[PDB]
């Protein structure tokens, strides 16, 4: 969280700003960013933009940062998600608009930090972001520069029955992930209230309030639910952190499969089977967690190599809220580095949605000058 | 989805369209509205497409503070659609019109090839006569005005979804479909003090509040513990991750009134058969924001569907 | 066997419905109509579903001796219907309303699942205001009156037939889709001498004459040699053994007038862009029969579609 003692100090850019840009940020852990000269003026932490006091605070600070740095925006950059407050405020402004994909923004926020301006391998892992195909993204591998992106790899889409409800009641997230193979998870599904289950299975079947997700956050939630870490959370990512803490020291992993069609896809349910088999055998949560973390590290590593082979690209960007996971970041940087990759991640801004606006700014800037 | 109503706005750009009203106000005197009904199933707990076709239009024609009088009915029917099913739909229509004190004065009937329509679509248009001193519009709201709702929120949306997708709950949910012209008439005793009337149909109460917000240039704060909901709907939503504010209503009206007259407006709603559950749910502010206060005062912004 | 219109007439039974007019006359001076439009293909020589949806209702709203003013537009659209086709339809609607001097003031758009409707249907309703001494009704024909048609017979019917069924002809046939409120306005100069006005749509000229016969309680005699018809339509029908009297029109009106004013009515039409091919075609009989005379005086009954 970048705030007192760091802000309102800007991010230095190599090339000077073509035209003044206001990046509105996203939803969770919001910051905004104003460009002028060699500086991107990212705001201090504002918070989740979903309430009146947050929004007012957000407004006032945009105006305050304008006065303090003599910036006058010529174009707004917003997230593609149509439901963010940051997006609506960007809609209401009488300025031209540049929409930027969430995870593209993540990858670019790290690129800005290292003054990169070339096609790179962008690994963006988080909970949610609106994708260009209308579905929820969060487990993406992209080939992108600051101008556009190509989507090369993701996890197989799973239903998220009830949307925000499944993010609180993560056993619902587990249900969506295991949906088309229910009978295998008999012991877990039998402990779901019969009435609610029937509703959930119908929600999935008839697509009522159910988004299809490719998401590292949700993957972790499903593991946490299946292996009895937590049925319900009090905040998004609670199960994620707890799963990281209880983990034991191990090199073991699970068997995964990379299917190639239009793009590289991995079925998470195939990994959940083995996870559940381990849990039913009475294996320690700590051991399972360790193995699961290594599985993610290993399949991301293998995916990096394949993409490098077909494209020639040697630079890897690691961003998205998932990389707040210390093990996941450290281990992945090393595995990739020891294999010849030039690996970059966030340091001046967060890998979480706090970094979004910096990425939004530099993408919108490349768009304008290009 | 709603990229279509956009094309509608730009090519039929005039003074009436841009106002985005429940019904056009013509000759400074009569209202005009149309609406299509495509609901499945055709027959559901607490009503049918027939009752719905009449009630929805009767209601929209009333929404400028007007008495509905004359309707049209157009039918698009699939070849081989059971005539016995059609008699029943049409009977419900004639009974609804009878209740609302309204007549079907013109119509049309089209038969199309099998697989060209799914059973039957109905369109109804309606005209009504404005009351004396009635100035009701989606633009009329102002900071200080009070927001009220006619009754329980979400009944129809959940009822139809429950019947269609065969969703089993502890308590079955019945549609609220009803003609409100009568309640509107008794509400229009306070003419000029009544500022906005709108039925929270497709898009729910949330959308209505956002439509008042955009068009009056105001914000709206509502309060959770004041929102009237049927227990079975509260629960249905809790099981599905659904906000009851997003659900369709067909027997409710959202009303915006002058602070001083708010109390009297609630009382006359409570004395009518379709407003016994009515409540004061919030007020109009100058914040240009649509917010909800949960228990213990948390000012979350209301999510647009 | 669409005896759906019988079920309709039973349930919405009233003065307005029993009359079977092109439009209801309300308050004595305003008129109200509705029509659905389900034509395939959506784009055909000489027009499209959009131009049709406007013109047809503009026409229906004038048939009572009225200036049409306001229209509603309801769209029922299939999931994934190409948006560029929609922009073309809407544009055609805008252009027709502009030419007719009419405004679309209210509407609706509904999107249904893929396969729940073949591409797109449109419903339009219309409001018009009666001219000073207008008294036009299908009940107004008396024996001695003259029957006129505003132009050639069977254009639209044969045009969509040709396009829909891929029938190649020696001459391409174009639809006659047009708003006739301008032509009707010039006819309504004749006031009460104009007795009946109806556009021969579904069922063609034949059906109109029978409707005039039924409701006025009279007969009608028409003359083969006096019937206007484009050669392309004539031989297209002659090749398939069709009577152009049964094919639909969308830019024509059948007019009944007082005997002394028939010459004036013809010249009023002939001096209008949509009335160049107008002809006196027959006479209202004492007989309750619809008959056609060939060359030399060979009478036969007109068969019903
Ligand atoms: Fe994110
Ligand atoms: Mg309405
Ligand atoms: Mg007609």
CA distance C293 to C298: 5
Residues belonging to chain A: 370
Q: Is there an interface between A and B (3+ Cβ pairs < 8 A)?
A: yes
Q: Which other chains touch chain A, taking contact as 3+ CB pairs less than 8 Å apart?
A: B
From the CA of A163, how many Å to the nearest CA of chain B?
A: 6
CA distance A35 to B193: 49
Say yes or no: A202 and A284 in one domain: yes
Nearest to C151 by CA among C170, C167, C175, C128: C175
Which H, E and C letters describe chain C, residue by residue? CCCHHHHHHHHCCCHHHHHCCCCEEECCCEEEEEEEECCCCCEECCEEHHHHHHHHHHHHCCCCCEEEEEEEEEEEEECCCCHHHHHHHHHHHHHHHHHHCCEEEEEEEEEECCCCECCEEEEEEEEEEECCCCCCCCCCCCCCCEEEECCCCCHHHHHHHHHHCCCCCCCCCCCCCCCCHHHHHHHHHHHHHEEEEECCCCCHHHHHHHHHHHHHCCEEEEEHHHCCCCHHHHHHHHHHCCCHHHCCCCCCCEEEECHHHHHHHHHHHHCCCCCCCCEEEEEEECCCCEEEECCCCCEEECCCC
Determine the distance separating the centroid of ligand 2 and the alpha carbon of A76, expressed in angstroms: 34
For residue A162, the chain B residues in CB contact (below 8 A) are 240-242
CA distance A259 to A155: 10
CA distance B53 to B89: 10
**Residue A93 lies inside a defined structural domain of this protein:** yes
Say yes or no: A75 and A183 in one domain: no
Tokens of A238: 């609670």
**Residue A4 lies inside a defined structural domain of this protein:** no
How many CA atoms, within 13 angstroms, populate the side-chain half-sphere of residue C147?
31
User: A199 vs B240: CB contact, 8 Å cut-off?
Assistant: yes
How many CA atoms, within 13 angstroms, populate the side-chain half-sphere of residue A83?
11
For residue C82, the chain B residues in CB contact (below 8 A) are none
Category of B166 on φ-ψ map: left (φ > 0), alpha (ψ -120 to 50) or beta:
left
| Domains of chain B in sequence order | 1-135 (3.30.1330.10), 136-305 (3.90.650.10)
Determine the distance separating the centroid of ligand 3 and the alpha carbon of C208, expressed in angstroms: 9
User: A51 vs B239: CB contact, 8 Å cut-off?
Assistant: no
- Nearest by CB to C70, which of B4, B32, B113? B32
Say yes or no: A209 and A280 in one domain: yes
CA distance A160 to A214: 10
Sorted by sequence, the CB contacts under 8 Å of residue A238 that are 6+ apart come out as A230
For residue C70, the chain B residues in CB contact (below 8 A) are 24, 26, 32
Say yes or no: A205 and A133 in one domain: no
Q: How far is CA A62 from CA A25, A31, A46, A86, in A?
A: 12, 10, 11, 12
Nearest to B161 by CA among B174, B178, B179, B171: B174
Task: Determine the structural domain holding residue A308 and report its residue range.
Answer: 101-152+300-352
**Residue A213 lies inside a defined structural domain of this protein:** yes
Q: Is there an interface between B and C (3+ Cβ pairs < 8 A)?
A: yes
Which residues of chain B from 223 to 242 reach within 8 Å of chain A, CB to CB?
239-242
E strand or H helix that includes residue A200: helix A194-206
Tokens of A1: 């969280």
Residue A208 carries which DSSP code?
T
For residue A199, the chain B residues in CB contact (below 8 A) are 167-168, 239-240
E strand or H helix that includes residue A121: strand A120-125
φ/ψ of A259, rounded to 5, equals -90, 130
CA distance B211 to B213: 5
Residues belonging to chain B: 305
B210 touches chain A (CB under 8 A): no
Nearest to A288 by CA among A329, A252, A328, A325: A252
CATH number at residue A341: 3.30.420.560
Angle between helices B4-11 and C83-100 (to 10 degrees): 30
- Nearest by CB to A208, which of B170, B240, B301? B240
Sorted by sequence, the CB contacts under 8 Å of residue C102 that are 6+ apart come out as C54, C58, C68, C69, C70, C71, C126, C179, C181
Tokens of A67: 């006065």
Determine the distance separating the centroid of ligand 1 and the alpha carbon of A171, expressed in angstroms: 22
For chain A, the domain total comes to 3
CA distance C225 to C232: 17
Residue A30 carries which DSSP code?
B
Nearest to A102 by CA among A119, A114, A84: A84
A147 by DSSP, 3-state: which? coil
User: A195 vs B168: CB contact, 8 Å cut-off?
Assistant: yes
Determine the distance separating the centroid of ligand 1 and the alpha carbon of B9, expressed in angstroms: 35
Angle between helices A238-245 and A326-337 (to 10 degrees): 70
Contact between A25 and A31 (Cβ < 8 Å): yes
Determine the distance separating the centroid of ligand 2 and the alpha carbon of C7, expressed in angstroms: 29
Q: Chain A residues within 8 A (CB-CB) of chain B? A: 50-53, 55, 83, 85, 161-166, 195-196, 198-199, 202-203, 206, 208-209
**Residue A138 lies inside a defined structural domain of this protein:** yes
CA distance C195 to C144: 12
In the numeric block, the tokens 């963006």 are attached to A124
User: B8 vs C125: CB contact, 8 Å cut-off?
Assistant: no
Contact between B160 and B39 (Cβ < 8 Å): yes
Contact between B79 and C81 (Cβ < 8 Å): no
What is the residue-wise DSSP string for chain B?
-TTHHHHHHHHT-STTTTTT-SSEEETTTEEEEEEEE--SSSEETTEEHHHHHHHHHHHHHHTTTEEEEEEEEEEEEETT--HHHHHHHHHHHHHHHHHHT-EEEEEEEEEE-TTSBSSEEEEEEEEEEEPTT----TT---TT-EEEESS-SSHHHHHHHHHHTT---SS---------HHHHHHHGGGTTTEEEEE---TTHHHHHHHHHHHHHT-EEEEEGGG----HHHHHHHHHHT--GGGS--SS--EEEE-GGGHHHHHHHHHTSTT-TT-EEEEEEETTS-EEEEETTTEEEEPPP-
CB atoms within 10 A of CB C103: 18
Q: Which ligand is nearest to the CA of B252?
A: 2
E strand or H helix that includes residue A243: helix A238-245
Residue A248 carries which DSSP code?
P
Nearest to C68 by CA among C103, C94, C93: C103
Contact between C289 and C183 (Cβ < 8 Å): no
CATH number at residue A25: 3.30.420.360
Residue A345, beta-bridge partner list: A318
Which long-range contacts does A234-240 make (Cβ < 8 Å, 24+ apart)? Answer: A236/A28, A236/A127, A236/A167, A237/A127, A237/A321, A237/A324, A239/A170, A240/A322, A240/A325
Cβ pairs bridging B and C (under 8 Å): 188
Say yes or no: A280 and A204 in one domain: yes
Tokens of A171: 């056993």
Say yes or no: A291 and A199 in one domain: yes
Q: Which ligand is nearest to the CA of B106?
A: 3
User: B73 vs C32: CB contact, 8 Å cut-off?
Assistant: no
Contact between C285 and C292 (Cβ < 8 Å): no
For residue B304, the chain A residues in CB contact (below 8 A) are 83
Say yes or no: A133 and A52 in one domain: no
Tokens of C116: 């729940």
Say yes or no: A277 and A336 in one domain: no
For residue A83, the chain B residues in CB contact (below 8 A) are 303-304
Tokens of A123: 């690994």
Q: Which ligand is nearest to the CA of A236?
A: 1
Say yes or no: A91 and A218 in one domain: no
User: B34 vs C93: CB contact, 8 Å cut-off?
Assistant: no
**Residue A56 lies inside a defined structural domain of this protein:** yes
Kindly tell me the sign of the dihedral angle through the C-alpha atoms of A108, A112, A118, A123: negative
CA distance A270 to A264: 15
Distance of CA B297 to the CA centre of its chain: 29
Say yes or no: A174 and A294 in one domain: yes
Say yes or no: A291 and A328 in one domain: no
Contact between B181 and B58 (Cβ < 8 Å): yes
CA distance B154 to B243: 9
Contact between B74 and C123 (Cβ < 8 Å): yes
CA distance A230 to A169: 9
For residue C110, the chain B residues in CB contact (below 8 A) are 36, 38
**Residue A16 lies inside a defined structural domain of this protein:** yes
User: A196 vs B239: CB contact, 8 Å cut-off?
Assistant: yes
**Residue A294 lies inside a defined structural domain of this protein:** yes
User: B4 vs C86: CB contact, 8 Å cut-off?
Assistant: yes
- Nearest by CB to A83, which of B169, B299, B304? B304
Provide the Cα torsion A86, B13, B61, B37; round to 10°: -70
User: A52 vs B289: CB contact, 8 Å cut-off?
Assistant: yes
CA distance C41 to C28: 39
Q: How far is CA C50 from CA B249, C96, C163, in A?
A: 32, 8, 17
From the CA of B278, how many Å to the nearest CA of chain A?
A: 27
User: C118 vs B103: CB contact, 8 Å cut-off?
Assistant: no
Kindly tell me the sign of the dihedral angle through the C-alpha atoms of A158, A164, A167, A171: negative
Say yes or no: A158 and A289 in one domain: yes
Sorted by sequence, the CB contacts under 8 Å of residue A45 that are 6+ apart come out as A1, A2, A3, A7, A29, A30, A31, A354
Tokens of A364: 């919108």
CB atoms within 10 A of CB A248: 13
User: A83 vs B167: CB contact, 8 Å cut-off?
Assistant: no
> What chain B residue is nearest to C91 in terms of C-alpha separation?
B11
Could you list the residues of A known to form a binding site for Fe(3+), using ranges.
102, 106, 126, 353
Contact between A79 and A23 (Cβ < 8 Å): no
> What chain B residue is nearest to C92 in terms of C-alpha separation?
B11
**Residue A177 lies inside a defined structural domain of this protein:** yes
CATH number at residue A219: 1.10.357.160
Sorted by sequence, the CB contacts under 8 Å of residue C66 that are 6+ apart come out as C23, C31, C128, C129, C130, C131, C134, C184
Determine the distance separating the centroid of ligand 1 and the alpha carbon of A138, expressed in angstroms: 7
Residue B60, beta-bridge partner list: none
Sorted by sequence, the CB contacts under 8 Å of residue A109 that are 6+ apart come out as A319, A346, A349, A355, A356, A357, A358, A359, A362
Kindly tell me the sign of the dihedral angle through the C-alpha atoms of C21, C26, C29, C32: negative
Tell me whether residue A183 is exposed, middle or buried, using C-beta atoms within 10 angstroms of its C-beta: 0 to 12, 13 to 18, 19 or more: exposed
From the CA of A172, how many Å to the nearest CA of chain B?
A: 10
């Amino acid at each position: 969280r970048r705030a007192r003692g760091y802000a309102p100090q800007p991010i230095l850019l190599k090339k000077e700003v073509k035209a003044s840009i206001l990046a509105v940020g996203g939803f969770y852990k919001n910051t905004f960013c104003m460009t002028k000269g060699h500086y991107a003026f990212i705001s201090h932490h504002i918070g989740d933009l979903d309430n009146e006091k947050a929004f007012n605070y957000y407004i006032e600070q945009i105006e305050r940062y304008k006065k303090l740095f003599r910036v006058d925006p010529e174009v707004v950059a917003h997230d593609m998600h149509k439901g963010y407050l940051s997006t609506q405020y960007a809609k209401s402004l009488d300025l031209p608009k540049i929409e930027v994909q969430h995870h593209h923004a993540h990858i670019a926020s790290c690129m800005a930090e290292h003054n990169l301006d070339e096609k790179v391998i962008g690994i963006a892992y988080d909970g949610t972001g609106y994708g260009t195909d209308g579905n929820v993204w969060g487990a993406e591998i992209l080939v992108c520069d600051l101008k556009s992106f190509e989507r090369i790899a993701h996890l197989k889409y799973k239903p998220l029955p009830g949307n925000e409800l499944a993010i609180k009641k993560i056993y619902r997230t587990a249900l969506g992930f295991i949906f088309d193979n229910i009978s295998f998870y008999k012991n877990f599904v039998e402990q779901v209230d019969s009435r609610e289950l029937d509703i959930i299975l119908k929600q999935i079947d008839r697509k009522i309030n159910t988004a299809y997700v490719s998401s590292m956050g949700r993957f972790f939630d499903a593991v946490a639910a299946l292996i009895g870490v937590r049925k319900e959370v009090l905040f998004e990512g609670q199960a994620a952190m707890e799963l990281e803490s209880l983990m034991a020291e191990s090199e073991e992993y699970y068997e995964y499969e990379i299917l190639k069609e239009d793009r590289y896809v991995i079925d998470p349910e195939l990994i959940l089977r083995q996870i559940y088999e381990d849990y039913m055998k009475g294996f320690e949560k700590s051991y399972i967690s360790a193995k699961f973390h290594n599985t993610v590290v290993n399949f991301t590593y293998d995916l990096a190599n394949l993409i490098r082979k077909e494209t020639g690209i040697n630079k890897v960007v690691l961003s998205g809220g998932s990389f707040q996971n210390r093990y996941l970041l450290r281990r992945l940087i090393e595995k990739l580095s020891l294999s010849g990759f030039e690996v970059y991640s966030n340091s001046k801004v967060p890998c979480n949605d706090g970094g979004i606006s910096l990425g939004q700014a530099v993408i919108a800037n490349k768009i304008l000058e290009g | 989805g709603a990229l279509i109503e956009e094309v509608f706005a730009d090519a039929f750009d005039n003074e009436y369209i841009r106002a985005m009203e429940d019904a056009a106000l013509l000759f400074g005197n009569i209202t005009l509205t149309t609406d299509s009904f495509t609901v499945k199933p055709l027959f559901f707990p607490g009503g049918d497409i027939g009752k719905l076709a009449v009630c929805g239009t009767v209601n929209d024609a009333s929404m400028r503070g007007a008495k509905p009088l004359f309707l049209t009915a157009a039918f698009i029917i699939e070849e081989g659609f059971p005539v016995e099913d059609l008699k029943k739909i049409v009977k419900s229509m004639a009974e609804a019109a009878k209740e609302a004190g309204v007549k079907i004065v013109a119509g049309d009937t089209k038969v199309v090839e099998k697989g060209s329509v799914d059973r039957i679509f109905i369109n109804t248009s309606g005209i009504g006569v404005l009351y004396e001193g009635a100035n009701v519009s989606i633009k009329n709201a102002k900071p200080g005005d009070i927001v009220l709702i006619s009754g329980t929120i979400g009944d129809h949306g959940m009822a139809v979804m429950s019947a269609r997708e065969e969703l089993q709950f502890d308590t079955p949910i019945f549609s609220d479909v009803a003609p409100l012209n009568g309640l509107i008439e008794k509400l229009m005793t306070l003419g000029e003090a009544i500022k906005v009337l709108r039925d929270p149909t497709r898009g729910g109460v949330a959308e209505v509040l956002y439509e008042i917000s955009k068009m009056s240039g105001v914000g709206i704060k509502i309060y959770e513990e004041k929102l009237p909901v049927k227990e079975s709907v509260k629960s249905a939503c809790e099981f599905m991750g659904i906000d009851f504010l997003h659900l369709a209503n067909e027997g409710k009206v959202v009303v915006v009134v002058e602070r001083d007259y708010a109390e009297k407006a609630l009382e006359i709603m409570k004395s009518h058969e379709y407003g016994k559950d009515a409540e004061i749910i919030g007020e109009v502010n100058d914040s240009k924001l649509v917010t909800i206060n949960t228990i213990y005062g948390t000012s979350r912004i209301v999510d647009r569907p």
